[PDB]
């Protein structure tokens, strides 16, 4: 259906022990396709998905040039933010930045975003009009004033409505084989007696893509939550995702329970029972 | 800042079959700040050649990382993940449970 | 494709 | 390649006429800004025009306008109704967050209108406190080839435009000098 | 106007000297840049800065450094000047990706010695009777000769007042020995006046050359007078004859 391109940046000061650590990663949907790590040997943007490797050296020089501009600007920002918040040069602080754009099934522009954080809290963010800013703090108002006056929103909006969307479409095209795919979950269920009184049914979904999924339990066809549990969706390490949900049941009652699985890769949702 | 303790899941890439090579994963998520120590252990012993994904983060700015290594599960070998983070008074050891 | 314009110091 | 190309290092235009300075560029990017700068004899870099790549309307500032053709990566500067004060270096330039890259520059000469020319070479004598007497090639029209010397010991200057404001009179001149071997302020010039 | 300042405006130093060129701006701009403009007029990026603590390298700067400990200041240090550092140094500030704002520049000459520095000799040449006869105008010529470095500002003064009307000066000085590194230079200028104004003996004409030479700081041991920054002039009076 809908798609996104997103870049994630983290800068971490390590005072005395060198320049800040800087990590950039780019995603299309739930697939990483590029990375930059300041402590890696190449000092270049590097590919992480097959289809981006057909971009030529001009692309790789360009992305490397730009990503360094991101890095060196964050390095300045770390000093600035320390000042804004009257913090010691002792100790480590973090700048994070995320931006990107969403397009629909027909690849039309849906929205854009550009969010910035300091020490893991909202600092400033571009609103949905792609024209104005939400500043979290009194400190962030200074940034908001500067960026207003310097028309940062105008520059970012041009990217988010234009370049971002155009290159996302290019990427979706070039990596159709693997981005425009669904991997339906492989499911199964496991049962572990917690004693003689009760047991645990575990509903598994494995090897699915994209990450979006929903697992729910039912008792006698009615939605059960009170003694459920559901882990955070997790990467398998091969490009697909895993998730499970479990429930504890009095034994000789397992057959009362069904697990329901919904995923883009399934024409119909699955109903699972203990076998 | 905020400071959030990591969630930790230990699991294999593929369904485990004793004697067949596979990958042992330790996924740490929801933590802040990003400095974190993650070791994979075979029978209490640190596994030497562990790789990890590139640092990224979620909607709430909390970080996540996948650590992983090749391994051959057996009936008797015990695998675990040891995680240390500033939010922790003691290192967290999570045992690999095949069914999890 | 990364942003080329609008990365400004805070 | 991140390059800015100005292929014509020098251009001339008659006073009050229009001239177009050419510029093309190469970039991996679609988001960038383009600029024209003017640097007069003062050597002060002065912004003429800025163009945002995402703006479809061509920038215009009085007599200066650009022809921004993004698909052709071309960014000509047109100077209409050219004035003597327009004489300068003109630099085309390309900008992103990181830096601005400048083309090599085009020197623009403006040829003044000379109302009654009277090309002639005069000899001028030092009001003593000095060395080496001088001759003055003057009152020639603006498309005049002022060659530059050799024979080691003569010196010939570039031409130079003179404005007697109150009389609304303009004239060109060049100077030649040399004291040692020989020299007449009759040849040197009108005979190069 | 533009509030970005460079000092000094002119400088001549000997090979091997460590020198700092100052650049300061009070406009609150986060980004600053240094460009070297060689003869031939190309601008080469040397150093730049995203903000305080940022000092990013540009090109083959041999071998310069910058500091950026505060927003206002971006000084450029040449550790051991070389003749190839002879250039126009342009400092610029910038907001985001917008236009750079350039300071007025520093014109630097790195000479092989210091003994090579000479002030100009200045002479004024009187209008020809043939020109006066033929055109009813009178052209004075100023000739400034034998100076190094080529750092001069020439102006004309009539009856004690600087004039700009009726004047043009050579666009740049010419080399008197065009194949030597530290060749001395020459420069001419014209002042054209009506024949009637020149014929009035009350009228006083002065060609003034401001020369930029050695610093008061520099040591000097030669007999010929330290060729510091100075004015050298030559004058003439109007004549009916």
PDB file of C-alpha atoms in Angstrom, chain A residues 7-263:
ATOM      1  CA  UNK A   7      16.417   9.067   7.563  1.00  0.00           C
ATOM      2  CA  UNK A   8      17.487   8.745  11.206  1.00  0.00           C
ATOM      3  CA  UNK A   9      20.502  10.575  12.642  1.00  0.00           C
ATOM      4  CA  UNK A  10      22.147  10.251  16.051  1.00  0.00           C
ATOM      5  CA  UNK A  11      25.034  12.348  17.329  1.00  0.00           C
ATOM      6  CA  UNK A  12      26.521  11.498  20.730  1.00  0.00           C
ATOM      7  CA  UNK A  13      29.199  13.631  22.365  1.00  0.00           C
ATOM      8  CA  UNK A  14      32.053  11.754  24.067  1.00  0.00           C
ATOM      9  CA  UNK A  15      33.955  14.722  25.596  1.00  0.00           C
ATOM     10  CA  UNK A  16      37.723  14.282  25.659  1.00  0.00           C
ATOM     11  CA  UNK A  17      37.493  10.998  23.782  1.00  0.00           C
ATOM     12  CA  UNK A  18      37.139  12.479  20.323  1.00  0.00           C
ATOM     13  CA  UNK A  19      34.565  13.998  18.003  1.00  0.00           C
ATOM     14  CA  UNK A  20      30.942  13.007  18.604  1.00  0.00           C
ATOM     15  CA  UNK A  21      29.836   9.587  17.377  1.00  0.00           C
ATOM     16  CA  UNK A  22      27.510  10.068  14.397  1.00  0.00           C
ATOM     17  CA  UNK A  23      25.229   7.425  12.896  1.00  0.00           C
ATOM     18  CA  UNK A  24      22.930   7.957   9.927  1.00  0.00           C
ATOM     19  CA  UNK A  25      20.557   5.321   8.563  1.00  0.00           C
ATOM     20  CA  UNK A  26      18.068   5.566   5.708  1.00  0.00           C
ATOM     21  CA  UNK A  27      14.944   3.423   5.327  1.00  0.00           C
ATOM     22  CA  UNK A  28      12.400   2.768   2.632  1.00  0.00           C
ATOM     23  CA  UNK A  29       9.426   1.287   4.512  1.00  0.00           C
ATOM     24  CA  UNK A  30      10.988  -1.311   6.867  1.00  0.00           C
ATOM     25  CA  UNK A  31      14.111  -1.860   4.779  1.00  0.00           C
ATOM     26  CA  UNK A  32      17.384  -0.112   5.578  1.00  0.00           C
ATOM     27  CA  UNK A  33      19.182   0.906   2.404  1.00  0.00           C
ATOM     28  CA  UNK A  34      22.047   3.172   3.467  1.00  0.00           C
ATOM     29  CA  UNK A  35      24.215   3.898   6.485  1.00  0.00           C
ATOM     30  CA  UNK A  36      26.990   6.160   7.700  1.00  0.00           C
ATOM     31  CA  UNK A  37      28.990   5.542  10.870  1.00  0.00           C
ATOM     32  CA  UNK A  38      31.657   8.056  11.891  1.00  0.00           C
ATOM     33  CA  UNK A  39      33.767   5.332  13.503  1.00  0.00           C
ATOM     34  CA  UNK A  40      33.747   3.076  10.422  1.00  0.00           C
ATOM     35  CA  UNK A  41      36.775   3.043   8.133  1.00  0.00           C
ATOM     36  CA  UNK A  42      35.352   4.340   4.851  1.00  0.00           C
ATOM     37  CA  UNK A  43      33.977   7.710   5.993  1.00  0.00           C
ATOM     38  CA  UNK A  44      31.424   7.308   3.218  1.00  0.00           C
ATOM     39  CA  UNK A  45      27.738   6.644   2.862  1.00  0.00           C
ATOM     40  CA  UNK A  46      27.461   2.872   2.353  1.00  0.00           C
ATOM     41  CA  UNK A  47      24.782   0.680   0.735  1.00  0.00           C
ATOM     42  CA  UNK A  48      22.680  -1.703   2.815  1.00  0.00           C
ATOM     43  CA  UNK A  49      20.109  -2.842   0.264  1.00  0.00           C
ATOM     44  CA  UNK A  50      20.849  -4.352  -3.175  1.00  0.00           C
ATOM     45  CA  UNK A  51      18.937  -1.908  -5.349  1.00  0.00           C
ATOM     46  CA  UNK A  52      20.700   1.280  -4.160  1.00  0.00           C
ATOM     47  CA  UNK A  53      23.986  -0.107  -5.517  1.00  0.00           C
ATOM     48  CA  UNK A  54      22.980   0.800  -9.049  1.00  0.00           C
ATOM     49  CA  UNK A  55      23.431   4.491  -8.133  1.00  0.00           C
ATOM     50  CA  UNK A  56      26.702   5.775  -9.563  1.00  0.00           C
ATOM     51  CA  UNK A  57      29.699   7.377  -7.823  1.00  0.00           C
ATOM     52  CA  UNK A  58      28.195  10.870  -8.178  1.00  0.00           C
ATOM     53  CA  UNK A  59      25.335   9.730  -5.941  1.00  0.00           C
ATOM     54  CA  UNK A  60      27.701   8.206  -3.405  1.00  0.00           C
ATOM     55  CA  UNK A  61      29.951  11.296  -3.378  1.00  0.00           C
ATOM     56  CA  UNK A  62      26.879  13.520  -3.032  1.00  0.00           C
ATOM     57  CA  UNK A  63      25.272  11.565  -0.187  1.00  0.00           C
ATOM     58  CA  UNK A  64      28.645  11.455   1.566  1.00  0.00           C
ATOM     59  CA  UNK A  65      29.099  15.199   1.176  1.00  0.00           C
ATOM     60  CA  UNK A  66      25.595  15.929   2.486  1.00  0.00           C
ATOM     61  CA  UNK A  67      25.724  13.455   5.361  1.00  0.00           C
ATOM     62  CA  UNK A  68      28.949  15.105   6.584  1.00  0.00           C
ATOM     63  CA  UNK A  69      27.141  18.445   6.533  1.00  0.00           C
ATOM     64  CA  UNK A  70      24.516  16.836   8.798  1.00  0.00           C
ATOM     65  CA  UNK A  71      27.263  15.466  11.057  1.00  0.00           C
ATOM     66  CA  UNK A  72      29.271  18.682  11.414  1.00  0.00           C
ATOM     67  CA  UNK A  73      26.144  20.748  11.984  1.00  0.00           C
ATOM     68  CA  UNK A  74      25.082  18.368  14.799  1.00  0.00           C
ATOM     69  CA  UNK A  75      28.538  18.708  16.310  1.00  0.00           C
ATOM     70  CA  UNK A  76      28.014  22.482  16.470  1.00  0.00           C
ATOM     71  CA  UNK A  77      24.485  21.866  17.853  1.00  0.00           C
ATOM     72  CA  UNK A  78      25.808  19.795  20.749  1.00  0.00           C
ATOM     73  CA  UNK A  79      27.880  22.776  21.921  1.00  0.00           C
ATOM     74  CA  UNK A  80      24.962  25.162  21.350  1.00  0.00           C
ATOM     75  CA  UNK A  81      22.377  23.036  23.206  1.00  0.00           C
ATOM     76  CA  UNK A  82      24.765  22.635  26.120  1.00  0.00           C
ATOM     77  CA  UNK A  83      24.709  26.449  26.280  1.00  0.00           C
ATOM     78  CA  UNK A  84      20.936  26.802  25.844  1.00  0.00           C
ATOM     79  CA  UNK A  85      20.352  24.467  28.778  1.00  0.00           C
ATOM     80  CA  UNK A  86      23.296  25.667  30.908  1.00  0.00           C
ATOM     81  CA  UNK A  87      24.872  22.211  31.115  1.00  0.00           C
ATOM     82  CA  UNK A  88      28.424  21.209  31.931  1.00  0.00           C
ATOM     83  CA  UNK A  89      30.890  20.250  29.227  1.00  0.00           C
ATOM     84  CA  UNK A  90      31.265  17.191  31.411  1.00  0.00           C
ATOM     85  CA  UNK A  91      29.399  14.180  30.177  1.00  0.00           C
ATOM     86  CA  UNK A  92      27.567  12.991  27.148  1.00  0.00           C
ATOM     87  CA  UNK A  93      24.568  14.373  25.331  1.00  0.00           C
ATOM     88  CA  UNK A  94      22.555  13.323  22.336  1.00  0.00           C
ATOM     89  CA  UNK A  95      21.156  14.958  19.242  1.00  0.00           C
ATOM     90  CA  UNK A  96      18.636  12.977  17.178  1.00  0.00           C
ATOM     91  CA  UNK A  97      16.954  13.987  13.954  1.00  0.00           C
ATOM     92  CA  UNK A  98      14.408  12.172  11.836  1.00  0.00           C
ATOM     93  CA  UNK A  99      12.863  13.301   8.571  1.00  0.00           C
ATOM     94  CA  UNK A 100      11.137  11.801   5.572  1.00  0.00           C
ATOM     95  CA  UNK A 101       8.003  11.530   3.486  1.00  0.00           C
ATOM     96  CA  UNK A 102       5.034   9.235   2.971  1.00  0.00           C
ATOM     97  CA  UNK A 103       3.354   8.402  -0.315  1.00  0.00           C
ATOM     98  CA  UNK A 104       0.140   6.447  -0.960  1.00  0.00           C
ATOM     99  CA  UNK A 105      -0.496   3.269  -2.959  1.00  0.00           C
ATOM    100  CA  UNK A 106      -0.409   5.211  -6.214  1.00  0.00           C
ATOM    101  CA  UNK A 107       2.751   6.929  -4.898  1.00  0.00           C
ATOM    102  CA  UNK A 108       1.141  10.362  -4.496  1.00  0.00           C
ATOM    103  CA  UNK A 109       2.503  12.615  -1.732  1.00  0.00           C
ATOM    104  CA  UNK A 110       0.690  12.188   1.593  1.00  0.00           C
ATOM    105  CA  UNK A 111       2.825  13.953   4.195  1.00  0.00           C
ATOM    106  CA  UNK A 112       6.311  14.983   5.259  1.00  0.00           C
ATOM    107  CA  UNK A 113       7.940  15.435   8.632  1.00  0.00           C
ATOM    108  CA  UNK A 114      11.170  16.636  10.214  1.00  0.00           C
ATOM    109  CA  UNK A 115      11.680  16.123  13.940  1.00  0.00           C
ATOM    110  CA  UNK A 116      14.597  16.990  16.236  1.00  0.00           C
ATOM    111  CA  UNK A 117      15.374  15.882  19.781  1.00  0.00           C
ATOM    112  CA  UNK A 118      17.880  16.607  22.529  1.00  0.00           C
ATOM    113  CA  UNK A 119      18.751  14.004  25.182  1.00  0.00           C
ATOM    114  CA  UNK A 120      15.807  11.893  24.077  1.00  0.00           C
ATOM    115  CA  UNK A 121      13.091  14.565  24.377  1.00  0.00           C
ATOM    116  CA  UNK A 122      11.226  16.543  21.689  1.00  0.00           C
ATOM    117  CA  UNK A 123      13.095  19.765  20.920  1.00  0.00           C
ATOM    118  CA  UNK A 124      11.656  21.195  17.695  1.00  0.00           C
ATOM    119  CA  UNK A 125       9.473  19.727  14.956  1.00  0.00           C
ATOM    120  CA  UNK A 126       8.062  20.793  11.610  1.00  0.00           C
ATOM    121  CA  UNK A 127       4.263  20.863  11.744  1.00  0.00           C
ATOM    122  CA  UNK A 128       2.060  19.137   9.143  1.00  0.00           C
ATOM    123  CA  UNK A 129       1.607  22.356   7.147  1.00  0.00           C
ATOM    124  CA  UNK A 130       5.350  22.081   6.418  1.00  0.00           C
ATOM    125  CA  UNK A 131       5.416  25.788   7.213  1.00  0.00           C
ATOM    126  CA  UNK A 132       5.579  26.259  10.985  1.00  0.00           C
ATOM    127  CA  UNK A 133       7.309  24.819  14.028  1.00  0.00           C
ATOM    128  CA  UNK A 134       6.441  23.268  17.377  1.00  0.00           C
ATOM    129  CA  UNK A 135       9.108  24.164  19.898  1.00  0.00           C
ATOM    130  CA  UNK A 136       9.022  22.010  23.006  1.00  0.00           C
ATOM    131  CA  UNK A 137      10.914  24.291  25.404  1.00  0.00           C
ATOM    132  CA  UNK A 138      11.785  27.841  26.188  1.00  0.00           C
ATOM    133  CA  UNK A 139      15.242  26.940  24.891  1.00  0.00           C
ATOM    134  CA  UNK A 140      13.804  25.669  21.624  1.00  0.00           C
ATOM    135  CA  UNK A 141      12.076  29.023  20.907  1.00  0.00           C
ATOM    136  CA  UNK A 142      15.461  30.513  20.082  1.00  0.00           C
ATOM    137  CA  UNK A 143      15.982  27.827  17.465  1.00  0.00           C
ATOM    138  CA  UNK A 144      12.425  28.354  16.289  1.00  0.00           C
ATOM    139  CA  UNK A 145      13.061  32.093  15.788  1.00  0.00           C
ATOM    140  CA  UNK A 146      16.325  31.532  13.884  1.00  0.00           C
ATOM    141  CA  UNK A 147      14.849  28.830  11.648  1.00  0.00           C
ATOM    142  CA  UNK A 148      11.739  30.915  10.954  1.00  0.00           C
ATOM    143  CA  UNK A 149      13.839  33.869   9.893  1.00  0.00           C
ATOM    144  CA  UNK A 150      16.117  31.630   7.782  1.00  0.00           C
ATOM    145  CA  UNK A 151      13.155  29.952   6.059  1.00  0.00           C
ATOM    146  CA  UNK A 152      14.255  26.469   7.011  1.00  0.00           C
ATOM    147  CA  UNK A 153      10.638  25.264   6.658  1.00  0.00           C
ATOM    148  CA  UNK A 154      10.486  26.510   3.056  1.00  0.00           C
ATOM    149  CA  UNK A 155      13.690  24.641   2.186  1.00  0.00           C
ATOM    150  CA  UNK A 156      12.602  21.487   3.928  1.00  0.00           C
ATOM    151  CA  UNK A 157       9.098  21.608   2.382  1.00  0.00           C
ATOM    152  CA  UNK A 158      10.643  21.803  -1.099  1.00  0.00           C
ATOM    153  CA  UNK A 159      12.526  18.602  -0.324  1.00  0.00           C
ATOM    154  CA  UNK A 160       9.644  16.803   1.377  1.00  0.00           C
ATOM    155  CA  UNK A 161       7.088  17.567  -1.383  1.00  0.00           C
ATOM    156  CA  UNK A 162       9.605  17.216  -4.194  1.00  0.00           C
ATOM    157  CA  UNK A 163      12.982  15.507  -4.026  1.00  0.00           C
ATOM    158  CA  UNK A 164      12.037  13.156  -1.168  1.00  0.00           C
ATOM    159  CA  UNK A 165       8.955  11.928  -3.040  1.00  0.00           C
ATOM    160  CA  UNK A 166      10.744  11.663  -6.398  1.00  0.00           C
ATOM    161  CA  UNK A 167      13.648   9.632  -5.053  1.00  0.00           C
ATOM    162  CA  UNK A 168      11.349   7.422  -2.955  1.00  0.00           C
ATOM    163  CA  UNK A 169       9.475   6.572  -6.160  1.00  0.00           C
ATOM    164  CA  UNK A 170      12.784   5.934  -7.889  1.00  0.00           C
ATOM    165  CA  UNK A 171      13.810   3.617  -5.084  1.00  0.00           C
ATOM    166  CA  UNK A 172      10.434   1.794  -5.055  1.00  0.00           C
ATOM    167  CA  UNK A 173      10.899   1.220  -8.802  1.00  0.00           C
ATOM    168  CA  UNK A 174      14.551   0.117  -8.676  1.00  0.00           C
ATOM    169  CA  UNK A 175      13.941  -2.192  -5.694  1.00  0.00           C
ATOM    170  CA  UNK A 176      10.492  -3.433  -6.726  1.00  0.00           C
ATOM    171  CA  UNK A 177      11.608  -7.075  -6.285  1.00  0.00           C
ATOM    172  CA  UNK A 178      12.110  -6.639  -2.570  1.00  0.00           C
ATOM    173  CA  UNK A 179      10.294  -3.407  -1.536  1.00  0.00           C
ATOM    174  CA  UNK A 180       7.022  -4.054  -3.340  1.00  0.00           C
ATOM    175  CA  UNK A 181       6.873  -7.544  -1.731  1.00  0.00           C
ATOM    176  CA  UNK A 182       4.896  -9.028   1.110  1.00  0.00           C
ATOM    177  CA  UNK A 183       6.071 -11.982   3.124  1.00  0.00           C
ATOM    178  CA  UNK A 184       3.076 -13.586   4.769  1.00  0.00           C
ATOM    179  CA  UNK A 185       3.803 -14.700   8.331  1.00  0.00           C
ATOM    180  CA  UNK A 186       4.695 -18.332   8.966  1.00  0.00           C
ATOM    181  CA  UNK A 187       2.624 -19.193  11.955  1.00  0.00           C
ATOM    182  CA  UNK A 188       2.491 -21.996  14.477  1.00  0.00           C
ATOM    183  CA  UNK A 189       1.553 -22.371  18.108  1.00  0.00           C
ATOM    184  CA  UNK A 190       3.316 -23.864  21.110  1.00  0.00           C
ATOM    185  CA  UNK A 191       2.015 -24.995  24.491  1.00  0.00           C
ATOM    186  CA  UNK A 192       3.935 -25.157  27.753  1.00  0.00           C
ATOM    187  CA  UNK A 193       2.404 -26.437  30.967  1.00  0.00           C
ATOM    188  CA  UNK A 194       3.113 -23.998  33.799  1.00  0.00           C
ATOM    189  CA  UNK A 195       2.152 -26.801  36.193  1.00  0.00           C
ATOM    190  CA  UNK A 196      -0.879 -29.071  36.291  1.00  0.00           C
ATOM    191  CA  UNK A 197      -3.298 -26.219  36.990  1.00  0.00           C
ATOM    192  CA  UNK A 198      -2.538 -24.088  33.904  1.00  0.00           C
ATOM    193  CA  UNK A 199      -0.675 -23.997  30.605  1.00  0.00           C
ATOM    194  CA  UNK A 200       0.590 -21.364  28.186  1.00  0.00           C
ATOM    195  CA  UNK A 201      -0.393 -21.107  24.537  1.00  0.00           C
ATOM    196  CA  UNK A 202       2.055 -19.120  22.391  1.00  0.00           C
ATOM    197  CA  UNK A 203       0.911 -17.795  19.014  1.00  0.00           C
ATOM    198  CA  UNK A 204       3.848 -17.228  16.660  1.00  0.00           C
ATOM    199  CA  UNK A 205       4.272 -15.136  13.522  1.00  0.00           C
ATOM    200  CA  UNK A 206       7.599 -15.443  11.767  1.00  0.00           C
ATOM    201  CA  UNK A 207       9.399 -14.379   8.614  1.00  0.00           C
ATOM    202  CA  UNK A 208       6.934 -11.639   7.723  1.00  0.00           C
ATOM    203  CA  UNK A 209       7.369  -8.353   5.843  1.00  0.00           C
ATOM    204  CA  UNK A 210       6.496  -5.491   6.295  1.00  0.00           C
ATOM    205  CA  UNK A 211       6.630  -5.218  10.092  1.00  0.00           C
ATOM    206  CA  UNK A 212       2.995  -4.144  10.568  1.00  0.00           C
ATOM    207  CA  UNK A 213       0.993  -7.014  12.080  1.00  0.00           C
ATOM    208  CA  UNK A 214      -1.724  -7.704  14.613  1.00  0.00           C
ATOM    209  CA  UNK A 215      -2.081 -10.773  16.813  1.00  0.00           C
ATOM    210  CA  UNK A 216      -5.175 -11.144  19.015  1.00  0.00           C
ATOM    211  CA  UNK A 217      -6.560 -13.898  21.225  1.00  0.00           C
ATOM    212  CA  UNK A 218     -10.170 -15.039  21.606  1.00  0.00           C
ATOM    213  CA  UNK A 219     -11.956 -17.252  24.142  1.00  0.00           C
ATOM    214  CA  UNK A 220     -15.061 -18.905  22.660  1.00  0.00           C
ATOM    215  CA  UNK A 221     -14.808 -16.470  19.744  1.00  0.00           C
ATOM    216  CA  UNK A 222     -14.767 -13.470  22.088  1.00  0.00           C
ATOM    217  CA  UNK A 223     -11.823 -11.064  22.420  1.00  0.00           C
ATOM    218  CA  UNK A 224      -9.699 -11.995  25.472  1.00  0.00           C
ATOM    219  CA  UNK A 225      -7.094  -9.592  26.902  1.00  0.00           C
ATOM    220  CA  UNK A 226      -6.922  -9.866  30.714  1.00  0.00           C
ATOM    221  CA  UNK A 227      -4.161 -12.485  30.915  1.00  0.00           C
ATOM    222  CA  UNK A 228      -2.561 -11.989  27.506  1.00  0.00           C
ATOM    223  CA  UNK A 229       0.943 -10.897  26.583  1.00  0.00           C
ATOM    224  CA  UNK A 230       2.389  -9.623  23.312  1.00  0.00           C
ATOM    225  CA  UNK A 231       6.063  -8.861  22.617  1.00  0.00           C
ATOM    226  CA  UNK A 232       7.393  -5.949  20.636  1.00  0.00           C
ATOM    227  CA  UNK A 233       7.861  -6.841  16.972  1.00  0.00           C
ATOM    228  CA  UNK A 234      11.478  -7.813  16.408  1.00  0.00           C
ATOM    229  CA  UNK A 235      13.861  -8.154  13.432  1.00  0.00           C
ATOM    230  CA  UNK A 236      14.859 -11.700  12.446  1.00  0.00           C
ATOM    231  CA  UNK A 237      18.144 -10.484  11.033  1.00  0.00           C
ATOM    232  CA  UNK A 238      17.372 -11.402   7.453  1.00  0.00           C
ATOM    233  CA  UNK A 239      15.023  -8.563   6.509  1.00  0.00           C
ATOM    234  CA  UNK A 240      11.855 -10.118   7.994  1.00  0.00           C
ATOM    235  CA  UNK A 241      10.146  -9.702  11.329  1.00  0.00           C
ATOM    236  CA  UNK A 242       8.897 -11.847  14.247  1.00  0.00           C
ATOM    237  CA  UNK A 243       6.186 -11.396  16.848  1.00  0.00           C
ATOM    238  CA  UNK A 244       4.272 -13.529  19.282  1.00  0.00           C
ATOM    239  CA  UNK A 245       1.352 -13.383  21.653  1.00  0.00           C
ATOM    240  CA  UNK A 246       0.603 -15.782  24.497  1.00  0.00           C
ATOM    241  CA  UNK A 247      -2.112 -16.529  27.019  1.00  0.00           C
ATOM    242  CA  UNK A 248      -2.289 -18.668  30.146  1.00  0.00           C
ATOM    243  CA  UNK A 249      -5.230 -21.069  30.239  1.00  0.00           C
ATOM    244  CA  UNK A 250      -6.574 -23.752  32.562  1.00  0.00           C
ATOM    245  CA  UNK A 251      -5.639 -26.993  30.808  1.00  0.00           C
ATOM    246  CA  UNK A 252      -8.462 -28.940  29.212  1.00  0.00           C
ATOM    247  CA  UNK A 253      -9.616 -25.569  27.919  1.00  0.00           C
ATOM    248  CA  UNK A 254      -7.000 -24.767  25.259  1.00  0.00           C
ATOM    249  CA  UNK A 255      -9.509 -25.584  22.504  1.00  0.00           C
ATOM    250  CA  UNK A 256     -11.608 -22.677  23.781  1.00  0.00           C
ATOM    251  CA  UNK A 257      -8.882 -20.372  22.502  1.00  0.00           C
ATOM    252  CA  UNK A 258      -7.993 -19.036  19.060  1.00  0.00           C
ATOM    253  CA  UNK A 259      -5.243 -16.740  17.859  1.00  0.00           C
ATOM    254  CA  UNK A 260      -6.068 -14.387  14.980  1.00  0.00           C
ATOM    255  CA  UNK A 261      -3.389 -13.070  12.634  1.00  0.00           C
ATOM    256  CA  UNK A 262      -3.746 -10.077  10.300  1.00  0.00           C
ATOM    257  CA  UNK A 263      -1.042  -9.106   7.864  1.00  0.00           C
TER     258      UNK A 263
END
